[PDB]
């Protein structure tokens, strides 16, 4: 029972229950996101998915709003752009100036979305917050000061990994992600939180400081550690293998690889 909705005036037929963001994907528009991962559950905390629906006073989160018949999604209206700029400013208000030394630098969703949907200057005239780093294991190098509380790691650990050890402690601006205790996040799919993290809060310890994204040459290959046959991308620079990244194959491995493969 496909219903008709409009994205910037273009008719697109979507099944009922489709999120606004998914219809925008149907017409090709990629709504900016920070907390929404299609594999994971919807959370609606990034607030970057706030888009304006025609004749609706209040903007809605595309990731969490099911479409209604006859809705016109204005993805580039002034309200949508202003909401995106405000959310980006709030995200970058406390974020540390770690881009040159952050391993995520060059492949950071925060950086790119700031360059594309955010302001080019900062009005923040106060001190930034700092968070003590947590140790979650020998694989994931953690700098929580860079975290944006997107909650991707938590939801991933709960749903895909199945290990309910990562959670949010505190309230308000002092809210911190991570084990309240000195527990170590151990799982086969533990390394995938590095990939899932938009910011360089969670990064690969063996890969740390080794190379920058633009240098690397990407070669698409298949892993041999297991008989699953996960598709991987072998990132090589100057003839040396630098890291192994998952490659999407919905039938075999959705977007994940084992720790041994990684």
């Amino acid at each position: 029972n496909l219903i008709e909705v409009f994205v910037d005036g273009q008719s697109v037929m979507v099944e009922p229950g489709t999120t606004v963001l998914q219809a925008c994907e149907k017409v090709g528009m990629q709504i900016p996101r920070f907390c929404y991962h299609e594999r994971l559950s919807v959370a609606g905390n990034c607030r970057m998915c706030l888009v304006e629906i025609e004749k609706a006073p209040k903007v809605v989160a595309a990731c969490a709003m099911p479409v209604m018949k006859g809705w016109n999604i204005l993805t580039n209206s002034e309200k949508s752009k202003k909401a995106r700029e405000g959310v980006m400013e709030f995200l970058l208000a406390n974020h540390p100036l770690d881009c040159p030394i952050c391993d995520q630098g060059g492949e950071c969703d925060l950086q790119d979305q700031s360059m594309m949907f955010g302001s080019d200057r900062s009005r923040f005239l106060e001190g930034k917050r700092a968070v003590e780093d947590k140790n979650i294991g020998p694989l994931v190098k953690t700098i929580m000061t860079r975290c944006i509380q997107c909650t991707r790691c938590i939801r991933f650990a709960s749903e895909i990994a199945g290990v309910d050890d990562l959670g949010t402690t505190g309230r308000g601006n002092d809210m911190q992600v991570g084990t309240y205790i000195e527990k170590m996040f151990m799982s086969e799919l533990s390394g995938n939180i590095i990939d899932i993290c938009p910011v360089g809060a969670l990064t690969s310890k063996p890969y740390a400081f080794t190379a920058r994204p633009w240098e690397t040459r990407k070669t698409e290959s298949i892993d041999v550690m297991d008989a699953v046959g996960s598709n991987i991308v072998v990132s090589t620079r100057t003839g040396e293998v630098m890291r192994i990244l998952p490659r999407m194959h919905e039938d075999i491995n959705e977007e994940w690889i084992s720790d041994k493969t990684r």
């Binding site: 002034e78 752009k81 202003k82 700029e85 302001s119 080019d120 200057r121």
Partner: protein, 96 residues
């Protein structure tokens, strides 16, 4: 310069000009190498309010070219522009 008066007179007469007034070599007239520290002004966009980037986003205001005619689907003659106006001889020195 440090030239004697005789040499200055000789060089000036040979030139037909007073070389002493305009000397190619540079003397104390040059600016001091060390200068007081500068304070460069900020631009128009350095504001704390009403400065949303959407208003001043030049790149996003560019659009694909408008198609005047496409083969794949009296009137007055027109020119690419009004004809150029003839230049006027310069008042300061019409003929060199």
């Amino acid at each position: 310069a440090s030239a004697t008066r005789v040499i200055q007179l000789l060089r000036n007469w040979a030139s037909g000009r007073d070389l002493q007034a305009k000397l190619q070599l540079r003397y104390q007239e040059i600016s001091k190498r060390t200068q007081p520290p500068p304070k460069l002004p900020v631009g128009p966009s350095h504001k704390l309010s009403n400065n949303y980037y959407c208003t001043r986003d030049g790149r996003r205001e560019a659009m694909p070219p408008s198609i005047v005619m496409s083969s794949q689907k009296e009137k007055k003659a027109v020119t690419p522009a009004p004809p150029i106006k003839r230049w006027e001889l310069s008042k300061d020195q019409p003929y060199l």
